[PDB]
């Protein structure tokens, strides 16, 4: 069966903003967010066709602050892969990545495997860098994952982070058992 492969579940988290709403609209409409407030629980699914199969990726831009924990934490259960999106101007959200990680671990542990991809947004600031990518990439190595620089401003590597993570989901759904 491959019906569990044509369906992907991806949750995008952050320290509040960062830009985890723009990337989604980019990957769906190819349009930059002029004015789109909601995205509290409001999210849409993207139809993509990879080499012949029309695949559906189910995305949630969840509220994550304290109040609406029922959107962030309580939704973590039914999500395969997770995109940790922060900006290198915020050392705080960098430190918070571990917190998000463990938040996910607290609700998911007895399943197959949790695909994690750390997404760095706003590679267009450069000099405003408060956290070195050097250690950020080191964190990728630390967790055995990948770290990708992106931006909805320049529109770079946006496709990559979405497709890359969804492909890992297939490996998780196929399981190992070796």
């Amino acid at each position: 069966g491959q019906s569990s492969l044509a369906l992907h579940k991806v949750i995008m988290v952050g320290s509040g903003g960062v830009g985890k709403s723009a990337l989604t609209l980019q990957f769906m409409y190819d349009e930059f967010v002029e004015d789109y407030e909601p995205t509290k629980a409001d999210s849409y699914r993207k139809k993509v066709v990879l080499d012949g199969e029309e695949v559906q990726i189910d995305i949630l831009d969840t509220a994550g602050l304290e109040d609406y924990a029922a959107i962030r934490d309580n939704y973590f259960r039914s999500g395969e892969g997770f995109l940790l999106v922060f900006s290198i101007t915020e050392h705080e959200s960098f430190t918070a990545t571990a917190e998000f990680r463990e938040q996910i671990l607290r609700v998911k542990a007895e399943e197959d495997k949790i695909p994690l991809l750390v997404v760095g947004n706003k590679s267009d600031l450069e000099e405003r860098r408060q956290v070195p990518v050097e250690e950020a990439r080191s964190k990728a190595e630390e967790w055995g994952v990948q770290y990708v620089e992106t931006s909805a401003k320049t529109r770079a590597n946006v496709d990559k982070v979405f497709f890359d993570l969804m492909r890992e989901i297939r490996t998780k759904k196929m399981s190992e058992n070796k």
Partner: protein
Amino acid sequence: GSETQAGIKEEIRRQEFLLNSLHRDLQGGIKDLSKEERLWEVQRILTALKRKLREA
């Protein structure tokens, strides 16, 4: 007119209600696996209802 969209809008509100309740109830610390799965499920229906709205 709003003939078909009427039923859609009311259905959207129903799905929003389902989502809203599950959101408010669970923020209080009460959550269950039935709720978590239904949360995603009704959400996907809400987003499909959005399509249904612009469909008619």
